[PDB]
Amino acid sequence: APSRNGMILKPHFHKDWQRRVATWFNQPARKIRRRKARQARARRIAPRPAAGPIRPIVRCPTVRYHTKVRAGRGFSLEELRVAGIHKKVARTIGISVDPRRRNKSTESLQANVQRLKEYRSKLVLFPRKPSAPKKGDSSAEELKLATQLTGPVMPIRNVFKKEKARVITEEEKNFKAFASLRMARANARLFGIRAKRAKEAAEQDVEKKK
Amino acid sequence: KTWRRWHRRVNTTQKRYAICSALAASALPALVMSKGHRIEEVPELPLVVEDK
Amino acid sequence: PSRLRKTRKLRGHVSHGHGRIGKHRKHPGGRGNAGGMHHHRINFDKYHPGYFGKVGMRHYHLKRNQSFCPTVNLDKLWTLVSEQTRVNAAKNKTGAAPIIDVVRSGYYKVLGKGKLPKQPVIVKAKFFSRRAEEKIKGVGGACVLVA
Amino acid sequence: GAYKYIQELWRKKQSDVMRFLLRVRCWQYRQLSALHRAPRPTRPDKARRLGYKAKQGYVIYRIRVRRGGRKRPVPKGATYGKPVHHGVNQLKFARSLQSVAEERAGRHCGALRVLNSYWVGEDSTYKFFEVILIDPFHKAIRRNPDTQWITKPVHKHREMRGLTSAGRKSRGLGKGHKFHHTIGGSRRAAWRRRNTLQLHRYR
Amino acid sequence: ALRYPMAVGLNKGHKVTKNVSKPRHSRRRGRLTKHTKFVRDMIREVCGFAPYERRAMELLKVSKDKRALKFIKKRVGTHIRAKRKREELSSVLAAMRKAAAK
RNA sequence: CAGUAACGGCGAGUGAACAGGGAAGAGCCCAGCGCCGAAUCCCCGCCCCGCGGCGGGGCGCGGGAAAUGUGGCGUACGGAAG
RNA sequence: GGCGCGCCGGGCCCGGGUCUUCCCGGAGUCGGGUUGCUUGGGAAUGCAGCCCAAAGCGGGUGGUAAACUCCAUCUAAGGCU
RNA sequence: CUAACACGUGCGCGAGUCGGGGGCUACGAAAGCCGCCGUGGCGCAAUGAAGGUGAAGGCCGGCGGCGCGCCGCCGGCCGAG
Ligand SMILES: [Mg+2]
Ligand SMILES: [Mg+2]
Ligand SMILES: [Mg+2]
Ligand SMILES: [Mg+2]
Ligand SMILES: [Mg+2]
Ligand SMILES: [Mg+2]
Ligand SMILES: [Mg+2]
Ligand SMILES: [Mg+2]
Ligand SMILES: [Mg+2]
Ligand SMILES: [Mg+2]
Ligand SMILES: [Mg+2]
Ligand SMILES: [Mg+2]
Ligand SMILES: [Mg+2]
Ligand SMILES: [Mg+2]
Ligand SMILES: [Mg+2]
Ligand SMILES: [Mg+2]
Ligand SMILES: [Mg+2]
Ligand SMILES: [Mg+2]
Ligand SMILES: [Mg+2]
Ligand SMILES: [Mg+2]
Ligand SMILES: [Mg+2]
Ligand SMILES: [Mg+2]
Ligand SMILES: [Mg+2]
Ligand SMILES: [Mg+2]
Ligand SMILES: [Mg+2]
Ligand SMILES: [Mg+2]
């Protein structure tokens, strides 16, 4: 029995919902439990980065978000083999790898290779046995100046290149942008049937000549 | 039931308004004695003590 | 607060604000939105026209991210970029137009509603209205596309 | 190797060689009883694909499930209720005959653990299956670090939680857009995550 | 003229230099090996042919290709598998004709 | 995202996912294709040690399993050999 | 009990780059027809019974049935965490 | 009592607004803090089944176009009933 005026609406309470209800009174209990587990892990991996391994520059998919840059799953192994880091040694020294990611581009691959080299310049690899150092190893006086960094290792900024204020050329002020958009729409929409009618006109001209 | 709406969330800006009003009223002598603190021998009631 | 609510004033009144003739029965008109075309048709046609029936093409796996194209108007175009750029554009005797990338602010399309102040621009966008690009031409300034 | 040849041989089931072999094995398995121990696999390649290794402790049964659908176990007609649920005899069971064949031998040998199972023969009224099982307390598998995962108490009766290869395939389980209604652990975990109210503290 | 990169059009999208990577090794699954071909043709000469396949061969001998296509499509499912089974049976009849002529 | 796309005497009602932000974060192993004199495994007997999670080593012309395939390399990120 | 060190004994004698030559895959299963259940999944999302039942530049997916035709994308019908 | 909606009222901010999810530091499971945690919600734009499109104009000078005294295109001016 609806009254005078208002939304007619569909509450999804026709099922037995009181039996299946999630009360969140352990919300601060979990917000204490997670940070206790996180402090324990950050003490357990004692000089290592507290956030974990390093994760690559990625673009988002799906037109709404492709302007932005995220942290990805892991460094692609094409991006590793041209950085000089072996696919098994990367995960040991702290480089996340996933083999599933392709590399469609070249700019992203060069950015991730530069990121791996800039990381490899910054890690302080301790000796696997503390008394005798080896060749793939850092110096003794750098070992005292190591500490855990907090937050993600080399945090991903979304930086924008600012253009300076140009002077408008006469060539740019004749660019009819709306009509160019609309002409591109119509050409992309009609491109197949243009070619089909060109095809049938070609064989009908063959019919008229032969 | 347990899922009574126990909690209330307040906007951050008026949470800040409230403590600014509390601090600013803790500097007036009439608004402290009317709260009840027997204060009449205090040197000055916006009362700052040595950092030691 | 039940201390402020109506039931504290309705103690002693033997019908509790629902009447003696028509008692407060449980569901006299059916539950929910019942009786759309039968006995509440007068309500659903005096207050919710168009509620019954199908119209339009069914589009199955719709994705709200393919059709993402937010808009901005020309009277708030200059609100994208800080005030120092347009002040220096008003002070510049060279004719150097400031460059405004609307996608960096987060709007793909530029539509033209308002009056745009008379100093040049390089507005780069992903789409343009017809009136928006000709307002940019009328102030004198370029419409750069970007994908 | 011979296993590629016998794999491509068992692929040609409509041929006369494998047709003769299937009908002779089906005669023999139909004469023999319902759940008996085979001493060695009939499909030595397929057993190796599914997990069998000829060592001490893996035990192969061939069992027959009686072929057909599932009529509703109800007195005479008389499924009481609305005309939706009046169906009796054209109903089909949610799991498969191979999964039923796994769990019948897994229940007949409660000490052992069903690894996997495969197909040996069929006729109009039976299907036959060789379910292969592992004795989880034998030292030829409890000292082998890549098959001692099944000796752990988590994997008791995989056949009846539906964790085998033929018990899995009735759970609607997989990645994709085809399997949206089982994200979470199961089609019950999906339903349970969807039909709750997350009533927060603040709201 | 100006050719700006456009979000719509025939050559829509942002201009990015596509690198040329060697293909991943999962993509070759099912590319026919010499050893696998040598196994499969031997298994076919051991076993023979299915009954529906030899009846489709009997349809192809008398040059009624269309109902042979319809028969193979009804027996195996999709039309693509139908045409593939047709061209393989046409190849085995072409081998049988040249073997019975030579 | 979303009470959305969708479903529904399109009536009542039902109703996900992708993307993005977080919590966490870890990857791997066979069968096959092969190559190594079955190079592999279980049990009992004796001796030494330890033995209230029956294990480590040595000796058995002692018994079995296994070529109807055990182990080592090797698995889609390719891999093996020279 | 844990993180710490020393000793005996036992196992293991192990890696990378370039070039050349070889090798590579899970079948009454995929899929198709039909029937019933289920799903938001709509000319059939998933599951199952029966019948047909494969292929290897193949197969699946690409949310409207189908034919031609290019692209993109993973590698099922085995297993652990 | 919980949820949704509608309107009226009081409060903070205001073309913005909000941390509710996460994180950082006895009472306190509170309170504070984040801002390259505004992802996201609502709002700032509507309309169309959809492809889509997407929210003032006016004046001057030149160039029966002549049997747009009405401008196609530019330079200047007023400017948002
Ligand atoms: Mg009323
Ligand atoms: Mg009264
Ligand atoms: Mg009343
Ligand atoms: Mg009365
Ligand atoms: Mg009444
Ligand atoms: Mg009355
Ligand atoms: Mg009532
Ligand atoms: Mg009526
Ligand atoms: Mg009913
Ligand atoms: Mg598992
Ligand atoms: Mg299946
Ligand atoms: Mg109706
Ligand atoms: Mg339902
Ligand atoms: Mg997501
Ligand atoms: Mg985190
Ligand atoms: Mg191995
Ligand atoms: Mg082997
Ligand atoms: Mg049912
Ligand atoms: Mg059921
Ligand atoms: Mg239903
Ligand atoms: Mg389509
Ligand atoms: Mg697999
Ligand atoms: Mg798998
Ligand atoms: Mg009302
Ligand atoms: Mg109000
Ligand atoms: Mg909304």
How far apart CA C103 and CA C68 sit, in angstroms, is 12
Q: Which nucleotide is nearest to B3 (CA to C1')?
A: H2
Residue D186, both tokens:
């199961």
Closest by CA to C101, choosing from A67, E3, A185, is A67
Q: CA A96 – C1' G30 distance (Å)?
A: 36
How far apart CA E97 and CA E102 sit, in angstroms, is 8
Q: List chains adjacent to chain B, taking adjacency as at least 3 C-beta pairs closer than 8 Å.
A: A, D
Strands D35-38 and D58-66, by their bridges, are antiparallel
A105 C-beta neighbours (distance < 10 Å), count: 15
Q: CA D163 – C1' F38 distance (Å)?
A: 34
CB E48 within 8 A of CB D16: yes
Exposed / middle / buried, residue A76 (Cβ in 10 Å: 0-12, 13-18, 19+): buried
Q: Looking at beta carbons, which residues of chain E come within 8 Å of D5? A: 39, 42-43
How far apart CA C43 and CA C30 sit, in angstroms, is 14
Q: Is any atom of strand H within 7 angstroms of residue B15's beta carbon?
A: yes
**Reported resolution in A?**
3.4
D15 C-beta neighbours (distance < 10 Å), count: 20
DSSP A107-175: HHHHHHHHHHHHHHTT--PPPSSSSS--SSS--STTTTT-----SSSS------PPPP-PBPPTTGGG-
Q: Is C144 on the interface with E (CB under 8 A)?
A: yes
Q: CA D143 – C1' F56 distance (Å)?
A: 15
CA angle D13, D16, D21 (to 5 degrees): 70
The structure's method of determination equals cryo-EM
CA angle C42, C44, C49 (to 5 degrees): 115
Query: Which ligand is the nearest neighbour of the Cα of A152?
Result: 15
How far apart CA D49 and CA E66 sit, in angstroms, is 41
- Contact criterion met (CB < 8 Å) for D198 and A27: no
How far apart CA C103 and CA C110 sit, in angstroms, is 10
Residue with tokens 């061969």: E57
Nucleotides of H under 7 A from a protein CB: 1-6, 11-13, 15-25, 29-33, 36, 39-40, 44-45, 49-56, 79-80
How far apart CA D143 and CA D44 sit, in angstroms, is 24
Q: Is any atom of strand H within 7 angstroms of residue B20's beta carbon?
A: no
How far apart CA D156 and CA B37 sit, in angstroms, is 71
| Distance between B5 CA and the closest CA of chain D, angstroms | 7
> Which residues of chain E from 38 to 97 reach within 8 Å of chain D, CB to CB?
39-40, 42-44, 46-53
Task: Please give the C-alpha separations between residue D23 and each of D124, E16, E53, in angstroms, as whole numbers.
Answer: 12, 62, 21
Task: Please give the C-alpha separations between residue D187 and each of A16, C22, D183, D184, in angstroms, as whole numbers.
Answer: 19, 48, 7, 8
Closest by CA to A104, choosing from A68, A161, A58, is A58
Bridge partners, A97 (sequence order): A75
Instruction: Tell me which H or E stretch contains A59.
Output: strand A57-59
Q: CA A41 – C1' H20 distance (Å)?
A: 29
Residue D6, both tokens:
């016998």
Q: Looking at beta carbons, which residues of chain A come within 8 Å of C100? A: none
DSSP chain D: -HHHHHHHHHH--SSHHHHHHHHHHHHHHHHS-SEEEESS-S-HHHHHHHT--SSTTEEEEEEEEEPS------SSS---S-TTS---TT---SS-HHHHHHHHHHHH-SSSEEEEEEEEEE-SSEEEEEEEEE-TT-HHHHT-TTTTTTTSGGGTTHHHHT-SHHHHTTTT--SSSTTGGG-SSSHHHHHHHHSSEEE-S--
- Contact criterion met (CB < 8 Å) for B6 and D199: no
Q: Which nucleotide is nearest to D49 (CA to C1')?
A: F31
Q: CA D47 – C1' F49 distance (Å)?
A: 43
Residue A162, both tokens:
């600012």
Q: List chains adjacent to chain A, taking adjacency as at least 3 C-beta pairs closer than 8 Å.
A: B, C, D, E
Number of C to E CB contacts under 8 A, please give it. 17
Closest by CA to E41, choosing from E92, E100, E97, E93, is E92
E96 C-beta neighbours (distance < 10 Å), count: 12
Mapping DSSP to helix (H, G, I), strand (E, B) and coil, where does residue A16 land? coil
Specify the amino acid at residue A28: P
- Contact criterion met (CB < 8 Å) for B7 and D199: no
How far apart CA D75 and CA D159 sit, in angstroms, is 30
B to C contact (≥3 Cβ pairs closer than 8 Å):
no
Crossing angle (nearest 10°) for helices D2-11 and D16-31:
80
Phi-psi region of B44 (alpha: psi -120 to 50; beta: other; left: phi over 0): beta
Q: Is A175 on the interface with D (CB under 8 A)?
A: no
Query: Which ligand is the nearest neighbour of the Cα of D169?
Result: 11
Nearest CA in chain A to B7: A25
Breaks (C-N over 2.5 A) in chain C follow: none
DSSP structural state of residue C96: B
